[PDB]
């Protein structure tokens, strides 16, 4: 039975959110560290009983859902709400096999035809990440949307939007101290808002940064990685040093 971390939006604070994301990181990692950045477990040869962690979310209305995250990339692969569980379309038959080990006692299992990458979820949501507000309120609402989906109360664009919210506030926050800090600001002020390009370009570039760092020459990138600032202006990262405060977890490479 996989490790569970619990979080509630009801009365959430910057401290309780911080404690939550720190705990999620602690279960994702163990660690293996390259140029000072922790590396997630290699998917190859990883035993199945170590492959996943569970995040149980609930809100003031006492609605609860449990997300499953893949420890190899910290990303959401599916969720359970009561008698039903739903999984993104797996990319290969090894991953398809792996998720049969999740929520094994649930009476109804479903695998969506679509995967959980942003390109696809944005389409289904009818909005880009740039136009989807994040915050404690949005998380509170996403929990409910996920909860009501099996009984037909949640439209598909709402569900997609709710995934996009959960994935950013949990997976991307775990991956990036920077994104964790951005979510803290919204919680602090109880003020929702959409992510700006500084957040969006880090998300889009997580795999490329993981590669750049692990393949670097003493921390120096073989080729620079371009990101955007809040105002859209472009800049390059040439070295791991400037990312030490920014990126917290890397997908395994070599």
């Amino acid at each position, epitope marked *: 039975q996989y490790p569970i971390i619990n979080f509630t939006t009801a009365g959430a604070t910057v401290q309780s959110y911080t404690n939550f994301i720190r705990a999620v990181r602690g279960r994702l990692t163990t660690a293996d560290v390259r140029h000072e950045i922790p590396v997630l477990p290699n998917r190859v040869g990883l035993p199945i009983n170590q492959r996943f962690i569970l995040v149980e979310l609930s*809100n*003031h*209305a*006492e*609605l609860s859902v449990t997300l499953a995250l893949d420890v190899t990339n910290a990303y959401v692969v599916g969720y359970r709400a009561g008698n039903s569980a739903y999984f993104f379309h797996p990319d290969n038959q090894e991953d398809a096999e792996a998720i049969t080990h999740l929520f094994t006692d649930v009476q109804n299992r479903y695998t969506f035809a679509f995967g959980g990458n942003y390109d696809r979820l944005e389409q289904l949501a009818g909005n880009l990440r740039e136009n989807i507000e994040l*915050g*404690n*309120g*949005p998380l*509170e*609402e996403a*929990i*409910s*949307a996920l*909860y*009501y989906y099996s009984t*037909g*109360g*949640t*439209q598909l664009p*709402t569900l997609a939007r709710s995934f996009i919210i959960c994935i950013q506030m949990i997976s991307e926050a775990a991956r990036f101290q920077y994104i964790e800090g951005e979510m803290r600001t919204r919680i602090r002020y*109880n*003020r*929702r808002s959409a992510p700006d390009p500084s957040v969006i370009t880090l998300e889009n570039s997580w795999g490329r940064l993981s590669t750049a760092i692990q393949e670097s020459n003493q921390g120096a990138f073989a080729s620079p990685i371009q990101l955007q600032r809040r105002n859209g202006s472009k800049f390059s990262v040439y070295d791991v040093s400037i990312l030490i405060p920014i990126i917290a977890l890397m997908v395994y490479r070599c």
Partner: nanobody
Amino acid sequence: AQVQLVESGGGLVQPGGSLRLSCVASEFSGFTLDYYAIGWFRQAPGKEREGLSSISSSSDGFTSYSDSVKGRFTISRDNAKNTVYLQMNSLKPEDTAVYYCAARLGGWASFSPQEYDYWGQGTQVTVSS
């Protein structure tokens, strides 16, 4: 016993007038109305139901308004009276319709009738002289 929503406040009004609709939740349902999202809808004989204004269950008080009513309508809460209000100012004849409230426990600010669970009985609003 499920929550029951009782509406009031509709009626005849002339152009430029206002009404205030109330959505009053029944006593002795478990959760109080501040735990719910509440959406307002209207529906005219030919037309399908139409979302106009909604307030989330979220604690940041998030509200949504359709372009037809922004700046004129205001949705608000009176928790002491287990009530949500819809203040409708600057009414014009094509606001004429039956108006409905709807609620969902832990809900979000939706314009889709499918994303609520409980409905008020409806109340007619007519604007003309």
